[PDB]
Symmetry: D2
Subunit: 396 residues, 4 copies
């Protein structure tokens, strides 16, 4: 064993894989990072040796993108991964590949609003039936499975309510009933929960949020448990033309290196903020998987590794007017905007910013209430973050 | 009026629009190029003033991308444009938006292979009927339209045969039958043919090819004739998550500046190469709209502005074996690879690469003969290009 | 000879070198463009095989930068080239490497104001004597050479007056007197004049201007006639830490591909604009090397290949007030700003924007008069450019 | 006050400044990150309103670069900062601005090798006297100052020996003698030591190392204690043409966000590795400010905040041959290369690489013994790092 080689028979530990997974020094120059293959097409040696160097056209595959895919498959525990322009593109490619007219698809009723809308407003025109149900009890999923069910699509924690789904239990149900279990674990990250380890067949990630973690790029990933599934996704990505770009892949290769230390800091901050909010006399309810009152505490402790995440939610006393006054007065360092997962702490109101297309009776039915505030905790000093919330709450 | 203003009541001439369309100096700093908005999310001033500055999240819209879209809409003569991660993503968004189960779509039978395979594999599973016909006679289109026809999808010149479609005549037919006419004018560029000027309802572009012209980025664009069509495309792009990235849009904003002078040089080179090939004893047939043997020379003179383009094709005598010997010996500066439209001259044999997914019997049905070679002419010195072809032909 | 090889014993023609110089397809993947080596450090195989793959640290050399250097040395006709963060960095590295206290340096008195200021205001504190003289007559240079003269630094055409220097004649003088002849040919480009072909020992370029040509990047280059000179420049670049970045090198590799067609278009536009101005009743003087009244016409015809360039200058009748009114009313597509060489046409007034640090009596002495306007012609439609000048002149 | 404002009268705490210092949402669009001003020149509103929007030409200043400069000045506690293409460019600008013929400069004799060689080769030719002395005792500095001394240039910890300099004491000396105290605190980072807080007049940083922390960019910064010093640095940067690019500034704006959590992880790992090495029988000496054998432990406790850093050094028993056997067998995840500060752990032997330009007798004079190894600890799992060192040491 010489410089440049791993020790044989040793599995590198987890943080080492975030730093080095999928990437060795460039064979040509020794460059320690992946060179960015900002290029459309690849020259072939001869007609007979077509594809002998592995690449032909960047819509189909690109070397920088492939380095990130290998890293993501390692981190998530999958056979292979495919990277996409956005998280929505990853989700839509799953629905495109694995559903056909007449099929039934069970979706957590608290899915990300984008997942919910691409199903209802687009794929349902192909006579695909999406049924939205409560995934908090796995027996609900078992009882709701119909003869035409092809896909069970879980999300955990859920955007924006932070409901959990028992991924292991649901995977056992789907394995018995021979249906595909797809899990969107964007809010968890693989540092907290790897659905493939818990039996899911496919994971979808919006790499926009925590894999990037810097508000820099859009991106998506599909991580497949098997070669058969991986090849189906890969084929359809080339047809739909929604692959990630090499430059986005370079950025994500760099930011993934710090995902463990970022998520540790964000989650330590979020625990302290959730505790503060839970004691605050102008806060009605606080939702965080790590505080003792979390309704699905036992599942959180079973299914979360290391941390309980950077996301929390709360409701201000006084209804919508008080929620709005609070939002309008939250000072820097907080940012009032959509998205989540970043070094910069973000405060969002789902009624207006993310789930505005959902009927208010239905919003209330899922738990998106009037004073409901979604919080993405960043890596600022937690005392500045609490000071800003306390000011805004005093104004509410 | 003053420095920094266009004079009111004047319309810039063609080349000026390539340099300046869609862009003004940054209002904040005066930067002569738009900055790159390499950022996911946009801060809002208040819950009330939501979207008051025009942006919320870059999957939906991004300022750099919107500047490119405004330029492209100006160059193509449309109401608005949407930009995509690839040309295939643009095409697939048209099929996704405008077709539903039971609908019918007419597609030119010599389409780019990717258009053909996204139809035939994928969308056909939704009980959408795609019919491939010969667009060289508009009455074929008129006769094949059904009550269920929603889209007529032309391409001109066609990939790889360079057949022309009479866009004005087909538009007249489609207007009478109230069917959408979508035209893929990637091979023409708007400098040679603007389908919206000739009555098409939608234009699809692979910006990868000539708009980029440098083998640098992938990209697509959909240019809509009306607000109603544009809004449908924009909505579905947000759902499918296949928008162009800001960094790609910046590259294409830069490269579009030189499209007229690039296409003029490529086309002058192509005319000379086509004339050379038409006299060479190893060459069976040459296809170029600018030489007198072109079968649709009358339509080329009616429909082509400025140039006859950088693309040509030819058949080497001696069939497949001769074509392969030739390809294996084409020297630099030629590149043996997929793609087209670039400063670097590219050659390929579609029977063995791009359209090798098509049955040889069907290959011949669509004119891709055994010795057929697609040539994308770049901006090198034409004597190097001709000397290289002459050397390669000596090995056939 | 097979695909991927050049024909042996053939020198590729000039436009082919702009497209392909310094770049072959990536050996690892076949990528047709140079991958961007966005990376600081390079891993070594062993202590003994240090530098066996050619790279160690990007301040010293970087693979993308080296690909551009090889291309620039080919285009300019030099032994080697070194690329820098800016044109000023290239110039300052020359002064740093080849002058020491007690040395005399002859500088064209109409040098770029930055060259003039770094000499007067900085290197003169090291007791280096910069003497500014009229380079229009080579015998002036011969007569002004002193025992301590080490460097003769010409520029042609000169910024902003467009005076020419006879590079061949001056090189003969410097070769006889054993002094180094450095030529800044930024305004010419190697498509119009290659000083190394005319005997200069070093060329300095601001790649910012025409090599980029898109207002995108800053950059500089030093092209050396010999290995001894090249190695001295390379060594000092590593010490001064002013190398070009890989991303800037990637952009310049792409934009250099179109330098010939850009400069042809800009120069055809500039000829027409200079003719228009020379007939205009509110224009006092027009300076362009291609119009028949140019005072150094005979030298322009001897020393310029293909074109007479994109730069021109003129004076409006009515002195400074009229020049200012004209500038304030020049409409789009023109831009009022510093810099030059770009696809976007630029109008500058040197008194305020570039040579404001020069005493007004001295400005007048060099020819930077009151109504003096420097024009950089882009690739817009020339009729829009003339329309805009004619409007502004009517307002002046 | 309102969303988007800092509360007046409050100062953000340390980690918040790393996330948000120097940056506010884009005023035009609300973009949460500053856009990349990848552009050379800036349009002016009128000849009169020249520079009214703050920018003219990116060699002089660029908006993205200025945002980074504001962040860096906040983090380091300075009046202002200037950013450069590399750390060497920052250092060379100090020597260029503040020294003239006849002046004297005191430099720590264990400086980074590049500082030492830019002094000894290059600036000494201008009759500037550089004197290299041992900064571990401040009275050496006091005794060596001459009437001609203009600059005292410290480094702490030193590259590669990790000697400390007492920055507060040296500043007191320099204040008494009215000499500029410049401190290169690259190895410390501002999270561990801010020399401006301890009385230094100027700080030099290689942002390549920890500010970047990802082996992605080269860069430098000069942080000035006063407006007069800042203005001198800014003026000369424009003359030397060695400003940082906008794209580099964007990368560093992103990576600085995580400097506290990166340095905390690197330092925790380094403490454990130093303790492991201090017990290993093949290791002669270990140098780390956090272990009790550190010779300057009293100063380390006074001068180091939060951590003792990611850098350590050790000597392998058996001299040069043993060091080489060890280096040749250090396995992944270690990288054998130059540079330091990164997420990827780096090891090198300065006698054979970084300081092999120093005479072995002088190498030993400055403490770089034959078996001396400089170690830059990254953020991998410490057990992989320790297992790899243990394997390598078994080959020594
Ligand atoms: C944001 C998000 C998505 C969609 O990803 P994009 O990258 O925005 O297209 C999907 N799932 C969750 C849980 C998300 O937060
Ligand atoms: C290449 C091409 C496409 C597909 O565009 P991509 O950018 O490769 O996805 C569509 N139409 C034509 C005519 C094409 O040449
Ligand atoms: C602009 C210029 C320079 C300086 O180059 P920068 O890239 O701006 O540092 C040098 N010479 C001429 C003739 C120039 O126009
Ligand atoms: C690397 C380094 C430098 C030089 O900075 P570059 O960015 O490599 O030019 C200066 N000081 C120290 C302590 C350094 O480690
Ligand atoms: C989706 C809104 S388009 C976004 N990622 C969010 O949940 O804020
Ligand atoms: C130099 C001004 S800093 C610039 N390139 C010009 O001449 O406009």
């Amino acid at each position: 064993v010489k410089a440049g080689d791993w020790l044989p028979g040793f599995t590198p530990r987890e943080e080492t894989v975030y730093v080095h997974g999928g990437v060795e020094p460039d064979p040509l120059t020794g460059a320690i990072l992946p060179p960015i293959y900002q290029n459309t097409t690849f020259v072939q040696e001869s007609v007979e040796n077509y594809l002998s160097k592995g690449f032909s056209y960047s819509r189909t595959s690109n070397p920088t993108v492939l380095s990130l895919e290998k890293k993501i498959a390692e981190i998530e525990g999958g056979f292979g991964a495919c990277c996409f322009a956005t998280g929505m593109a990853a989700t839509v490619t799953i629905f495109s590949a694995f559903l056909a007219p007449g099929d039934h698809c069970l979706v957590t009723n608290c899915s990300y609003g984008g997942t919910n809308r691409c199903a209802r407003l687009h794929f349902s025109k192909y006579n695909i039936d999406f049924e939205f149900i409560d995934f908090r009890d796995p027996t609900n999923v078992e009882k709701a499975i119909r003869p035409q069910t092809k896909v069970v699509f879980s999300e955990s924690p859920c955007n924006p309510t932070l409901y959990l789904a028992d991924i292991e239990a649901i995977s056992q149900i789907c394995k018995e009933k021979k249906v595909l279990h797809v899990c969107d674990s964007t809010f968890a990250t693989p540092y907290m929960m790897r659905p493939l380890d818990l039996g899911a067949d496919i994971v979808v990630q919006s790499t926009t949020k925590y894999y990037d973690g810097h508000n820099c790029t859009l991106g998506g990933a599909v991580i497949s448990s098997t070669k058969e599934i991986h090849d189906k996704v890969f084929f359809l990505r080339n047809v739909m033309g929604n692959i990630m770009s090499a430059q986005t892949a370079f950025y994500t290769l760099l930011t993934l290196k710090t995902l463990p230390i970022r998520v540790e800091k964000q989650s330590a901050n979020a625990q302290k903020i959730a505790e503060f909010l839970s004691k605050h006399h102008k806060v009605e309810h606080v939702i965080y998987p790590g505080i003792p009152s979390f309704p699905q505490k036992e599942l959180a402790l079973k299914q979360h590794k290391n941390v309980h995440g950077g996301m929390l939610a709360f409701e201000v006393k006084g209804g919508t007017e008080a929620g709005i006054r609070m939002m309008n007065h939250v000072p820097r360092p907080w940012s009032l905007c959509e998205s989540l997962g970043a070094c910069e702490s973000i405060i969002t109101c789902p009624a207006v910013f993310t789930h505005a297309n959902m009927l208010r009776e239905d919003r209330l039915k899922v738990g998106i209430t009037d004073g409901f505030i979604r919080v993405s905790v960043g890596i600022e000093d937690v005392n500045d973050l609490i000071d800003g919330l306390d000011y805004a709450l005093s104004k509410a």
